[PDB]
Structures are given as structure tokens and as C-alpha cells.
Design a protein around this ligand. Sequence first.
Ligand code: SF4
Ligand code: SF4
Ligand code: ZN
Lengths: 96, 114, 52, 113, 176, 49, 95, 208, 43, 52
Amino acid sequence: ASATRLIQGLRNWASGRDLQAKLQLRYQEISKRTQPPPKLPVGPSHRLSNNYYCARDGRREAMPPSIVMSSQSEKKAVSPAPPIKRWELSQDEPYL
Amino acid sequence: TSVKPIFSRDMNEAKRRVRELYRAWYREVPNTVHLFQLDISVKQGRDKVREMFKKNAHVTDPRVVDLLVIKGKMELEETINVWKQRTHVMRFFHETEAPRPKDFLSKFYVGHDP
Amino acid sequence: REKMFEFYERVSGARMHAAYVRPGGVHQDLPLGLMDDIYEFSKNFSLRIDEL
Amino acid sequence: LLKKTTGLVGLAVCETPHERLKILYTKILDVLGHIPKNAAYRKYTEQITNEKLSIVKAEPDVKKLEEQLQGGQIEEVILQAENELSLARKMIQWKPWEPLVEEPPASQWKWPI
Amino acid sequence: TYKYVNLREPSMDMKSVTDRAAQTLLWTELIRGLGMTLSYLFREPATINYPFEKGPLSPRFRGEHALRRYPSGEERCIACKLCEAVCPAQAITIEAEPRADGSRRTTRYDIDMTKCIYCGFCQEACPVDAIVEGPNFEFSTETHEELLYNKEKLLNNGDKWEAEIAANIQADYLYR
Amino acid sequence: MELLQVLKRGLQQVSGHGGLRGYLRVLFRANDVRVGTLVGEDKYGNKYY
Amino acid sequence: GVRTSPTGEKVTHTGQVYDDEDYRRVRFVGRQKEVNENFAIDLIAEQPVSQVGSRVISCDGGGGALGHPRVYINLDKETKTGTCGYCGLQFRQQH
Amino acid sequence: TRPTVRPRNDVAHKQLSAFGEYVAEILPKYVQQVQVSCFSELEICIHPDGVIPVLTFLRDHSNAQFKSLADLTAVDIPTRQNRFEIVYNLLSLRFNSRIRVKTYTDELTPVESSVSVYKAANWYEREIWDMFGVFFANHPDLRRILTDYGFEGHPFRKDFPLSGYVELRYDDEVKRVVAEPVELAQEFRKFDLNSPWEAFPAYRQPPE
Amino acid sequence: VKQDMPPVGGYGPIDYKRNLPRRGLSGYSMFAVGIGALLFGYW
Amino acid sequence: VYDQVEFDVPIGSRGDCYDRYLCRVEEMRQSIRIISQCLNKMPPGEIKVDDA
Ligand code: SF4
Ligand code: SF4
Ligand SMILES: [Zn+2]
């Protein structure tokens, strides 16, 4: 940022870009190293009522794997899922 | 009590394979001493190959000796190709290891282990 | 890449091995002013890709 | 209209896709007729192959055939038909409609142990 | 939602063919590359003057371990061994006894700084903020065992760096 | 011309370290001669700018 | 209150010192034995016993969330002061 | 159970159950179990004589098209008589799906190599030779891939110790890196962490 | 609450596309300059 | 939350080292696009699961 306008114009010309607009070195535009203290919010389970853990217990609603076939008609042939949708070419920048 | 074989249908084909592996190792020992510039004799290396074969001489299962032939062929391929260095070949010769006490009285002297 | 390691160090305290993304969320919230510096990095990073 | 490339490396463009698909589907049905009638591989593969062959006979276009066969490019649909043919020729040899060769041991699939 | 990098056919009119042949014979893109490198020649470099200048750090930084005391001189550690239970490298070795006033304190507190992975799980497992991983990163030794810290070295790192560790914990305890 | 300002900033970097003795002192100790605002000095003599 | 063995070796706050005939003193030969001279058992005994006017006091070591978990100390013994098991600060019911 | 619990996917659960029935009745010669976990992942437990007919099916069948071998894995379980559990993770790009094909072997029974199905397996099962000792028949170049060249044993078995049996150091008498029996300056401290209260009643086993 | 949040109108637009900005003379012009330099040198 | 961010996927055409190079360059471009969207759409709230 401290460069003279002769070196600045030379540097912009040699790169072919406006380099002073986007300087990779950092100056006073970055955040302060000292910040005010935060007040972080609490989650949804910080409630004094209607907050029994048996109604929000993720690990205890895990089930054993449902056994479909075990060795102890004209029904449709299935796939594991419907076939994947063909992607759309990008409207932003297709390179075509 | 009916299992699937690995290579051998019985013990005799397995002993054929053990025999051919010992033949291949016996042929390879002088090349191994020469190109790894080992400071053992060729007789000492052939004695070590004899020792590594005769350690396993009590095995009566065809599948286990098939796997021992397979692992011995893998060691042989890693020795013929220079994939092992001199250190991996000389690890069969426990040189830096001091000889452990073998009788009862000296094991009693040195510590607690049997 | 040094500035992005500063982003890792500000978010976790280690420049590379953060141990930050944990099962259940992340270990710690963003420090105040971090997203402004991520903005100031990202706004200028396109010119760096362009000159590469 | 002759699509210039498939977009996939090593997958060439098929000049006549409809005739190639009809040949491959009738060849899959021919190989698949050698399988017994009770076999679920025969019934399921005849079902999907007859559906695909009906769709190929129903559409003159290549693009609309690609959008309603729903398998990507038409050339990888041809590739999938060849893989299905090779699979069915192997399934003749394997005979997997036969009963289970061996029950597993008593707690072979018990987890947690 | 996808794009094709390198799916351009170059134009085949005489203008573009002569442009490409002038690029070939007259080396236009090579002069472009030389110009970009000359553009970096006239930039101020990114080099800081270490050790007189220092790389920027945060108060979350995980450096050298230290044991903290209360604002009465009593050490915070009450020998609960949560730091050595959580320790991913088993770098912490703790032995304890009741000392002469019956307080629950450690007799051994070792951190192997050559096993330690500097992940800070010990400081966040600590219920009393006793073990902390401080701001110091400049503690290279000439001997392996000088990095095998015992309780005396860790309490001395606490006494050495407490004026800074207290301010980093002041700036970062509300995120914890 | 803006080269004259560059040479004048260099000469006042020489004049800003307390002459040629301080300039060469900080040049050989620091390998940097730019001047700053003295933020402080500790009880050891480390000076912070 | 650090002291010194007959071998000249400093005794740590734990009480560790090497014996005279112990070879492991040779690691301190030509070098130092790093002990910490701030004994917490001495520094906590310098604190004044806090007179309070309740029957049960609480202690978190000060600093709120920067100290230890908050514990409640019963002060019904007039023989003994109520001592925090975390910080070692001790309390006495004033009546 | 809205914010903190993972939302259950019933549609993919139903579709994977139907496709597991499909795979099981097309291939009943080898398929021993079919199961779908609660997080909607399909496992096809097969017999080890049908590694190749199953995996060539799922790679080539027009309703499966599992064209990618994502990962091949062994799991040692010493309480089983077939202690090794070989696990094939497959990715179908066409139907945007993943499947798991699990089979078993012990120390001595070979598994047929799936390099004629997926060339990707060429190192994975080679790793399974190095780490578990599961021999693979008809592998093109079966040898070790991760351990040291003179290494005895197979490390990822659970009867193999955490540290090895030998450690290495440079010996200056012999001018060489040498192997010695391992002696730790500090033993690894085994922690007994398991709580004696049952955590998950859904997974309770019936008693003796 | 006080939390690391973006500004109210959001951040500014960030460039992310390729910018190789096409400098230099044409091929006709570069061959003409090279031929003119040769003709000056020959003369 | 990748289903909520908008980005493109660079596709090669010849499978060589050069197309993979261009794919990585354009993935850096699209990563800058995703980072812009993530900085614009960062919600408030907690950073761990409140299942303690
Ligand atoms: S930082 Fe991590 S590895 Fe190091 S002592 Fe603490 S818990 Fe152990
Ligand atoms: S440092 Fe903290 S976690 Fe470790 S034993 Fe002491 S009080 Fe417990
Ligand atoms: Zn207290």
C-alpha cells in the first residue's frame, strides 16, 4: 500500500490487473484483536418445563437393523432408489 | 470336518510344495549373501533357512502348511527382488539380542519370568 | 494458505490439527470478528486464483 | 442430429442407437430364455428388458429416448445392455436360483456379540 | 449445476489462426507469465522479521502446558485425573495422595511433551481450569528428556506465564 | 516527483534512529531500519514499537 | 517453605528428595534440580479464615465461572473451620 | 423429538427393504440375511462361496449398477468360529445408492478375489492379507502392502497386541537398524471404561 | 445475545469467476511489428 | 447444508492431468462461491447438540 504511483502503475500494467483494489497484504480493514465479550445463545433444550429427556433422546430411539430376509406373483422389479436425475448445465457459467 | 483347501488336497501335495520352496530358498541363499553384501557365510544362511523350515516341522494340517508355503514364497519374493534391505535379511540373525537364560537357575537369577 | 491457517488458529487454537468439528456439532463457537476476516480473505482470493 | 461426443472418456458415440439397442435387447431375451421359468432373475430381467425394448420401439428420437429410458446417455444405456447380457450369460453358469448352499453358523451374524 | 472446463473448440477463421500462430512463434503467453512474475517483483513482500516480529495468534492458541493456581497461591489441581483419562495420547501421568492438611493434591503430574498431540482436550476436561495449554510455542530443547515435564516444570510454567494465561482465559472463557 | 519523497523517508529513517550510529546498530541487530512509535519498554530493555 | 537435604538437594513440595546413596542424583550433576518454590500448602495457610453469618456458605473459588464448581460448606462445627475441598479457603460461622 | 434427534427417512428405508427382497430372491443360493439399519443402510449377508456371483450381479444388473467398489474391509470377531467378517461397500451412481455385502471366513479358508469384478479390490483385500491374514485365492499379486518387510503376524487381529512384539533401533556395533523385543519405558495404560448399567434396551440380548 | 453474525444487509458480492482479461495486440499486428523491425534492421 | 448452497460442479472432458487441474481450479472458484453463501446465511444459535 506504501508503493509509489510509478511502481503502482508499473505493477498494475505488468500483472494486467488492478492490484491495489485487492491487496493480499492486510491493513486496518481486518477485525480488532480485542473484542467485546459475547453472549452466546442456548439450545432448544434449555427449557425449565416440557423438557423431559425421554422425549428428546436420540440414542435410545436407535433400533436394531430390521431383518428383511433371513435363513432363520408378477411383482415389479425394483431399484434401490429411483434413477438419478440428469444434472442441469449451469445457467451461471456453462463454458459453452 | 470337511473344509475347503487352499492349494493342497492332502499332506503329500503340501510336502511337495514345502520341498520346492526349500529348493528355491537353497538356490537363492548365495545370491542373497552376495548382493546384500552380508557378512555371514553361505553355509550360515543355509543353516538359517534349514532352521526356519524345521521350526514348522510339527504341523499336520494341509491348510496351515499351504499358508506357510505362501508366506515363505512371499519372503522369498521380497528377498529376490531388492525389497528387503540388508536389515530385513539380518533380522533372522538375532545378533544384538543377548542370549537369554535357558536353564532354570539363571532365569531364577535374572528375574521373575519362566 | 497462511491466512487460512490463521482462520483455523482463531477458531480452534491450532493451525492444522484443530480437533474442531466434533460429533454433535463443533467444539466452540466462532470468535467475534472471524467472519469479517473470512470475508476480507474471500473477497480478494479470486485475484490470487486468476494469477495462478 | 449426431451428438458430437458422449461427454464420457473412452465411451464412443453410437451412430445407430436404436438398432443396436434392439439387437442387444432381443439377445438378452434370447440368452434369458435359457434360464428356468421359476427363477426370479429370469422374470425380473425379462420384465425390465421388455419394458426397455417397448420404449425403444415406441420412440424414433434419440433425445426423448434418453429422457424416458432414464439411464443417462444412450451409449451408456448400450453399455448397460451389454453388461446385462454378459451377466445373464454368467448366471446360466452360476445357477443362483438353486437353494442356499449352506446355512451360516448359529451366531454368525449376531451383532453385538 | 455442472460446467465443462475445457470444452472449447478454437475458432478457425484466419484471424484466430494467425493469433494462435503469433502466440506460437512470438511467445505471447510466455511474456504474459514473465509480466506476472515482474508484477510480483515490485510488491512489498509478506516476510515478517522474526524474531523481532511475531506471527499473529489468538487467545485460543494451544502451546506449552502449565498448571494454574488460585488468586491465593493454592494450586487449582485437585488430582481428579480427568485430563489423563481424556488424553488421546496418554501423555499425562498422575499420582496423588492426601497431603498434610488433608487436601486432595497430586504427588506426580507428568506430561510427556513428545507424546502430547497439543489438542487441548485436557484443558477443556479440567473442571477447575488447572491444566491449561498456554501461549508459549518457543520451547525447543537440545535434549529429549527436557520435554518430559514433571509437576515442578508445569507449576513453574504456570508461575512464569500466569500473567498471560489469565488474560487469554479472560478473553476466551465466555466461548467455553 | 515521488522518488524524492522516498529518498527523504530513507534519510529521515537514518535521522530517526538517532543518527548513523543508531541506524547501523538497528541495521545489524535487526536487519530492519524502519521507525515506529515507541509503545513501551519492559524491565529488561526490550523496546516495543 | 522449601528446605534442603543433607546432600544439598532441595526437597519438593511433595517431599521427594533422592537419597545419599542413590545414583540418580547424577542427572543433576553439572545441572540443576528444578523445584517450585511456591508451596501451595504454605500459601493457602496464609489466608484469613473468613467469618460469615450463615449456617451454610457457598464457595466457587472466586471469579464466577473461572473458579471451581460451586460447593456448599456446613459450618456447624465450632471446633473446626469449614474448608473448601476444591480451593482450600476456609470459613467460620461468626456466632 | 424434533431439534436434537436425527430425522428418520422412511422412504429410503422402504425402498432399501424392497430392493433387499429383490436381491435375496434373485440370488437365494448365497444370500443368508438381508437387513436395513435405522439410518437406512442395506446389508446383504451372503455365503463366501458366492462373493463373485453376487458382486458381478450388483455391478452388472440393470436395477443395481453398483459400479464403484467404495471400500473393502475385514472385521475380526474372535467369539465367532469364522472370526473374520469381510465387508464390501458398493456405490451405484445410477440409482444414487450404496449397499453393503458382508461375508465371512476363518484363518484358513480362502476367499475368492474380486479383482475380476472390481479392480479396485486389488489393494484392499491385499491389505486384508497384510492386516488380518485372510488369504485371497486367485489374487494377481498377493503380498504385504502396509507392514514392514520382515513383519510376522497380522496386526489388525484383536489377539495381536497394540504395540508389536518387536521394536527397531539403530545399533552402532552392527551399523544397522535392528529388531529387538519391545520394551516400553511406560506401559500403555489399559482403561476399563464400560459402565455396568445398560445403555440401550433396544439392543438387549436374551439371557442364558 | 452477542454472536458472530453477518451484517444486516449481508456481506458484499464476492467475485469468483475467471478474469484473464485479454491484453496485447492482434496476431496481424504482432507480425507487422516484427516485419517492420526486420525491415528497419535490414535497411 | 450442502443442499442449501448453490454451486457448480466442474466436469472434465478428456480425463487427463490438464482437465483435472482445471477441475481443481474451478472447484476453488466454486468454494469461494459457497463461502460467500455461508457467510451470508450463517444462522444464530448453539454450536453443539443440546443432548448433553
Ligand atoms: S493437549 Fe491433548 S495430548 Fe496433550 S496432554 Fe492435553 S489431552 Fe493429552
Ligand atoms: S489438572 Fe484438572 S483435570 Fe487434571 S487431575 Fe488436575 S484438576 Fe483434574
Ligand atoms: Zn472454594
